[PDB]
mmCIF file of all heavy atoms in Angstrom:
data_model
loop_
_atom_site.group_PDB
_atom_site.id
_atom_site.type_symbol
_atom_site.label_atom_id
_atom_site.label_comp_id
_atom_site.label_asym_id
_atom_site.label_seq_id
_atom_site.Cartn_x
_atom_site.Cartn_y
_atom_site.Cartn_z
ATOM 1 N N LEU T 1310 10.809 25.510 5.739
ATOM 2 C CA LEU T 1310 11.030 26.916 6.080
ATOM 3 C C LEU T 1310 9.916 27.839 5.571
ATOM 4 O O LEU T 1310 9.523 28.755 6.293
ATOM 5 C CB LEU T 1310 12.408 27.400 5.576
ATOM 6 C CG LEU T 1310 13.663 26.843 6.277
ATOM 7 C CD1 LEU T 1310 14.932 27.399 5.593
ATOM 8 C CD2 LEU T 1310 13.679 27.167 7.767
ATOM 9 N N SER T 1311 9.432 27.616 4.352
ATOM 10 C CA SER T 1311 8.310 28.409 3.793
ATOM 11 C C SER T 1311 7.035 28.116 4.575
ATOM 12 O O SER T 1311 6.223 29.000 4.811
ATOM 13 C CB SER T 1311 8.097 28.082 2.313
ATOM 14 O OG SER T 1311 7.916 26.692 2.131
ATOM 15 N N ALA T 1312 6.835 26.861 4.955
ATOM 16 C CA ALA T 1312 5.707 26.519 5.832
ATOM 17 C C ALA T 1312 5.800 27.247 7.176
ATOM 18 O O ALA T 1312 4.803 27.739 7.706
ATOM 19 C CB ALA T 1312 5.649 25.022 6.070
ATOM 20 N N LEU T 1313 6.995 27.273 7.756
ATOM 21 C CA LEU T 1313 7.200 27.993 9.010
ATOM 22 C C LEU T 1313 6.807 29.473 8.855
ATOM 23 O O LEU T 1313 6.066 30.011 9.695
ATOM 24 C CB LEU T 1313 8.657 27.857 9.497
ATOM 25 C CG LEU T 1313 9.064 28.543 10.812
ATOM 26 C CD1 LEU T 1313 8.160 28.128 11.980
ATOM 27 C CD2 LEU T 1313 10.550 28.241 11.088
ATOM 28 N N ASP T 1314 7.280 30.113 7.787
ATOM 29 C CA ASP T 1314 6.976 31.525 7.519
ATOM 30 C C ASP T 1314 5.470 31.737 7.512
ATOM 31 O O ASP T 1314 4.936 32.679 8.125
ATOM 32 C CB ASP T 1314 7.505 31.958 6.152
ATOM 33 C CG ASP T 1314 9.046 32.038 6.077
ATOM 34 O OD1 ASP T 1314 9.710 32.192 7.119
ATOM 35 O OD2 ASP T 1314 9.585 31.996 4.943
ATOM 36 N N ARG T 1315 4.788 30.879 6.764
ATOM 37 C CA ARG T 1315 3.362 31.056 6.555
ATOM 38 C C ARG T 1315 2.584 30.791 7.862
ATOM 39 O O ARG T 1315 1.708 31.565 8.257
ATOM 40 C CB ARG T 1315 2.900 30.156 5.404
ATOM 41 C CG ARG T 1315 1.435 30.272 5.038
ATOM 42 C CD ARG T 1315 0.983 31.720 4.919
ATOM 43 N NE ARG T 1315 -0.435 31.823 4.586
ATOM 44 C CZ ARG T 1315 -1.150 32.942 4.679
ATOM 45 N NH1 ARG T 1315 -0.599 34.076 5.105
ATOM 46 N NH2 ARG T 1315 -2.436 32.920 4.359
ATOM 47 N N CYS T 1316 2.919 29.697 8.532
ATOM 48 C CA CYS T 1316 2.228 29.336 9.774
ATOM 49 C C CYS T 1316 2.403 30.406 10.879
ATOM 50 O O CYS T 1316 1.442 30.742 11.589
ATOM 51 C CB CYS T 1316 2.706 27.998 10.277
ATOM 52 S SG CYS T 1316 2.160 26.612 9.279
ATOM 53 N N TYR T 1317 3.613 30.942 10.995
ATOM 54 C CA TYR T 1317 3.904 31.986 11.967
ATOM 55 C C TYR T 1317 3.101 33.243 11.663
ATOM 56 O O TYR T 1317 2.582 33.903 12.576
ATOM 57 C CB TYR T 1317 5.413 32.301 11.963
ATOM 58 C CG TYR T 1317 5.908 33.210 13.089
ATOM 59 C CD1 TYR T 1317 5.314 33.195 14.358
ATOM 60 C CD2 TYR T 1317 7.017 34.021 12.903
ATOM 61 C CE1 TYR T 1317 5.779 34.026 15.383
ATOM 62 C CE2 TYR T 1317 7.509 34.844 13.927
ATOM 63 C CZ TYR T 1317 6.896 34.830 15.170
ATOM 64 O OH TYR T 1317 7.352 35.650 16.178
ATOM 65 N N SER T 1318 3.009 33.598 10.387
ATOM 66 C CA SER T 1318 2.195 34.753 10.006
ATOM 67 C C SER T 1318 0.693 34.548 10.315
ATOM 68 O O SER T 1318 0.026 35.470 10.782
ATOM 69 C CB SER T 1318 2.405 35.108 8.538
ATOM 70 O OG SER T 1318 1.362 35.961 8.078
ATOM 71 N N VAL T 1319 0.146 33.367 10.023
ATOM 72 C CA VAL T 1319 -1.269 33.096 10.317
ATOM 73 C C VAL T 1319 -1.492 33.099 11.852
ATOM 74 O O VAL T 1319 -2.430 33.721 12.357
ATOM 75 C CB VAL T 1319 -1.790 31.763 9.657
ATOM 76 C CG1 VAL T 1319 -3.251 31.429 10.082
ATOM 77 C CG2 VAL T 1319 -1.727 31.843 8.143
ATOM 78 N N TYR T 1320 -0.599 32.439 12.583
ATOM 79 C CA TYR T 1320 -0.631 32.441 14.053
ATOM 80 C C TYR T 1320 -0.640 33.884 14.580
ATOM 81 O O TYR T 1320 -1.481 34.227 15.401
ATOM 82 C CB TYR T 1320 0.558 31.644 14.636
ATOM 83 C CG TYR T 1320 0.593 31.635 16.157
ATOM 84 C CD1 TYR T 1320 0.022 30.601 16.876
ATOM 85 C CD2 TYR T 1320 1.191 32.675 16.865
ATOM 86 C CE1 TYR T 1320 0.045 30.593 18.259
ATOM 87 C CE2 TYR T 1320 1.212 32.691 18.238
ATOM 88 C CZ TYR T 1320 0.631 31.652 18.947
ATOM 89 O OH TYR T 1320 0.661 31.679 20.331
ATOM 90 N N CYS T 1321 0.272 34.730 14.084
ATOM 91 C CA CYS T 1321 0.351 36.129 14.537
ATOM 92 C C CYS T 1321 -0.904 36.950 14.210
ATOM 93 O O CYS T 1321 -1.333 37.795 14.990
ATOM 94 C CB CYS T 1321 1.599 36.803 13.970
ATOM 95 S SG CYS T 1321 3.107 36.189 14.748
ATOM 96 N N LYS T 1322 -1.483 36.694 13.046
ATOM 97 C CA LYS T 1322 -2.699 37.382 12.626
ATOM 98 C C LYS T 1322 -3.832 37.024 13.585
ATOM 99 O O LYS T 1322 -4.623 37.885 13.992
ATOM 100 C CB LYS T 1322 -3.050 36.962 11.194
ATOM 101 C CG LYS T 1322 -4.175 37.734 10.517
ATOM 102 C CD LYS T 1322 -4.434 37.166 9.097
ATOM 103 C CE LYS T 1322 -4.760 38.237 8.050
ATOM 104 N NZ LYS T 1322 -6.205 38.609 7.999
ATOM 105 N N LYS T 1323 -3.902 35.747 13.961
ATOM 106 C CA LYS T 1323 -4.955 35.304 14.850
ATOM 107 C C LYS T 1323 -4.790 35.864 16.255
ATOM 108 O O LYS T 1323 -5.776 36.298 16.842
ATOM 109 C CB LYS T 1323 -5.065 33.772 14.847
ATOM 110 C CG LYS T 1323 -5.572 33.245 13.533
ATOM 111 C CD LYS T 1323 -5.817 31.724 13.489
ATOM 112 C CE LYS T 1323 -6.409 31.337 12.109
ATOM 113 N NZ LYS T 1323 -6.600 29.864 11.844
ATOM 114 N N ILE T 1324 -3.568 35.877 16.797
ATOM 115 C CA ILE T 1324 -3.375 36.400 18.153
ATOM 116 C C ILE T 1324 -3.587 37.910 18.201
ATOM 117 O O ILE T 1324 -4.179 38.443 19.157
ATOM 118 C CB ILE T 1324 -2.030 35.978 18.784
ATOM 119 C CG1 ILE T 1324 -2.173 36.058 20.319
ATOM 120 C CG2 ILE T 1324 -0.865 36.782 18.215
ATOM 121 C CD1 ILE T 1324 -1.134 35.333 21.111
ATOM 122 N N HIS T 1325 -3.151 38.598 17.150
ATOM 123 C CA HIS T 1325 -3.330 40.037 17.051
ATOM 124 C C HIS T 1325 -4.795 40.409 17.132
ATOM 125 O O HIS T 1325 -5.149 41.405 17.774
ATOM 126 C CB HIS T 1325 -2.756 40.582 15.730
ATOM 127 C CG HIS T 1325 -1.257 40.576 15.661
ATOM 128 N ND1 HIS T 1325 -0.567 40.831 14.494
ATOM 129 C CD2 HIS T 1325 -0.318 40.316 16.601
ATOM 130 C CE1 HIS T 1325 0.733 40.753 14.724
ATOM 131 N NE2 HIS T 1325 0.910 40.428 15.992
ATOM 132 N N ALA T 1326 -5.649 39.623 16.467
ATOM 133 C CA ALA T 1326 -7.106 39.885 16.460
ATOM 134 C C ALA T 1326 -7.753 39.715 17.858
ATOM 135 O O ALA T 1326 -8.618 40.516 18.280
ATOM 136 C CB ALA T 1326 -7.804 39.003 15.418
ATOM 137 N N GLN T 1327 -7.315 38.690 18.579
ATOM 138 C CA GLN T 1327 -7.752 38.494 19.966
ATOM 139 C C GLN T 1327 -7.297 39.635 20.874
ATOM 140 O O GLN T 1327 -8.098 40.191 21.615
ATOM 141 C CB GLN T 1327 -7.222 37.180 20.506
ATOM 142 C CG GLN T 1327 -7.810 35.977 19.801
ATOM 143 C CD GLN T 1327 -7.289 34.668 20.362
ATOM 144 O OE1 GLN T 1327 -6.357 34.664 21.161
ATOM 145 N NE2 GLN T 1327 -7.881 33.544 19.931
ATOM 146 N N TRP T 1328 -6.004 39.965 20.803
ATOM 147 C CA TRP T 1328 -5.420 41.063 21.563
ATOM 148 C C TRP T 1328 -6.131 42.382 21.288
ATOM 149 O O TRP T 1328 -6.398 43.132 22.227
ATOM 150 C CB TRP T 1328 -3.918 41.224 21.248
ATOM 151 C CG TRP T 1328 -3.029 40.158 21.848
ATOM 152 C CD1 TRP T 1328 -3.386 39.204 22.743
ATOM 153 C CD2 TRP T 1328 -1.620 39.995 21.632
ATOM 154 N NE1 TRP T 1328 -2.302 38.434 23.078
ATOM 155 C CE2 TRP T 1328 -1.201 38.905 22.417
ATOM 156 C CE3 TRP T 1328 -0.678 40.652 20.834
ATOM 157 C CZ2 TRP T 1328 0.133 38.454 22.440
ATOM 158 C CZ3 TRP T 1328 0.652 40.208 20.853
ATOM 159 C CH2 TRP T 1328 1.038 39.113 21.647
ATOM 160 N N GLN T 1329 -6.423 42.665 20.016
ATOM 161 C CA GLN T 1329 -7.069 43.925 19.625
ATOM 162 C C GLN T 1329 -8.459 44.084 20.254
ATOM 163 O O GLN T 1329 -8.850 45.195 20.639
ATOM 164 C CB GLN T 1329 -7.173 44.030 18.098
ATOM 165 N N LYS T 1330 -9.202 42.983 20.338
ATOM 166 C CA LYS T 1330 -10.505 42.954 21.029
ATOM 167 C C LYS T 1330 -10.381 43.346 22.509
ATOM 168 O O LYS T 1330 -11.280 43.995 23.064
ATOM 169 C CB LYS T 1330 -11.140 41.555 20.947
ATOM 170 C CG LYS T 1330 -11.723 41.174 19.587
ATOM 171 N N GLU T 1331 -9.271 42.931 23.127
ATOM 172 C CA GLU T 1331 -8.961 43.234 24.525
ATOM 173 C C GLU T 1331 -8.253 44.575 24.680
ATOM 174 O O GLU T 1331 -7.734 44.878 25.758
ATOM 175 C CB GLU T 1331 -8.048 42.151 25.109
ATOM 176 C CG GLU T 1331 -8.662 40.774 25.215
ATOM 177 C CD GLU T 1331 -7.616 39.667 25.372
ATOM 178 O OE1 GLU T 1331 -6.416 39.978 25.552
ATOM 179 O OE2 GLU T 1331 -7.998 38.478 25.295
ATOM 180 N N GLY T 1332 -8.191 45.366 23.611
ATOM 181 C CA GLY T 1332 -7.535 46.672 23.663
ATOM 182 C C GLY T 1332 -6.014 46.645 23.697
ATOM 183 O O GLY T 1332 -5.386 47.596 24.174
ATOM 184 N N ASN T 1333 -5.412 45.570 23.191
ATOM 185 C CA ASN T 1333 -3.962 45.475 23.056
ATOM 186 C C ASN T 1333 -3.579 45.466 21.564
ATOM 187 O O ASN T 1333 -3.916 44.527 20.828
ATOM 188 C CB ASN T 1333 -3.460 44.225 23.780
ATOM 189 C CG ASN T 1333 -1.976 43.964 23.567
ATOM 190 O OD1 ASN T 1333 -1.202 44.869 23.248
ATOM 191 N ND2 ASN T 1333 -1.572 42.712 23.757
ATOM 192 N N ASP T 1334 -2.870 46.510 21.123
ATOM 193 C CA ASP T 1334 -2.513 46.676 19.706
ATOM 194 C C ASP T 1334 -1.037 46.380 19.417
ATOM 195 O O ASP T 1334 -0.495 46.840 18.407
ATOM 196 C CB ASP T 1334 -2.859 48.092 19.231
ATOM 197 C CG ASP T 1334 -4.346 48.394 19.332
ATOM 198 O OD1 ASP T 1334 -5.161 47.572 18.845
ATOM 199 O OD2 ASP T 1334 -4.698 49.453 19.896
ATOM 200 N N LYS T 1335 -0.389 45.600 20.280
ATOM 201 C CA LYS T 1335 1.019 45.262 20.071
ATOM 202 C C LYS T 1335 1.168 44.120 19.077
ATOM 203 O O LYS T 1335 0.231 43.348 18.873
ATOM 204 C CB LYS T 1335 1.713 44.921 21.398
ATOM 205 C CG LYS T 1335 1.590 43.467 21.863
ATOM 206 C CD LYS T 1335 2.624 43.161 22.940
ATOM 207 C CE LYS T 1335 3.029 41.696 22.959
ATOM 208 N NZ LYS T 1335 4.247 41.511 23.789
ATOM 209 N N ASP T 1336 2.349 44.033 18.463
ATOM 210 C CA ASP T 1336 2.709 42.911 17.581
ATOM 211 C C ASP T 1336 3.373 41.781 18.383
ATOM 212 O O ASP T 1336 4.198 42.030 19.268
ATOM 213 C CB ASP T 1336 3.675 43.349 16.464
ATOM 214 C CG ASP T 1336 3.027 44.265 15.420
ATOM 215 O OD1 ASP T 1336 1.800 44.175 15.161
ATOM 216 O OD2 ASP T 1336 3.781 45.066 14.831
ATOM 217 N N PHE T 1337 3.008 40.550 18.036
ATOM 218 C CA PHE T 1337 3.598 39.340 18.580
ATOM 219 C C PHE T 1337 5.013 39.191 18.037
ATOM 220 O O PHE T 1337 5.230 39.345 16.831
ATOM 221 C CB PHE T 1337 2.749 38.119 18.166
ATOM 222 C CG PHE T 1337 3.153 36.826 18.840
ATOM 223 C CD1 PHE T 1337 2.443 36.340 19.924
ATOM 224 C CD2 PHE T 1337 4.255 36.101 18.390
ATOM 225 C CE1 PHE T 1337 2.809 35.152 20.555
ATOM 226 C CE2 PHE T 1337 4.645 34.941 19.028
ATOM 227 C CZ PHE T 1337 3.906 34.461 20.119
ATOM 228 N N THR T 1338 5.960 38.884 18.921
ATOM 229 C CA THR T 1338 7.338 38.541 18.528
ATOM 230 C C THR T 1338 7.786 37.287 19.267
ATOM 231 O O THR T 1338 7.043 36.740 20.086
ATOM 232 C CB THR T 1338 8.348 39.645 18.868
ATOM 233 O OG1 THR T 1338 8.554 39.681 20.286
ATOM 234 C CG2 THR T 1338 7.889 41.032 18.350
#
Side-chain angles (χ1 to χ4, degrees), chain T residues 1310-1328 1331-1338:
Chain T
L1310 290 178
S1311 55
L1313 180 55
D1314 290 337
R1315 182 47 181 166
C1316 289
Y1317 190 32
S1318 164
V1319 175
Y1320 179 94
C1321 289
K1322 189 182 218 274
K1323 292 185 177 175
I1324 203 163
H1325 289 170
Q1327 294 181 350
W1328 287 351
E1331 295 162 8
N1333 174 23
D1334 298 310
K1335 86 164 208 167
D1336 291 330
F1337 188 100
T1338 72

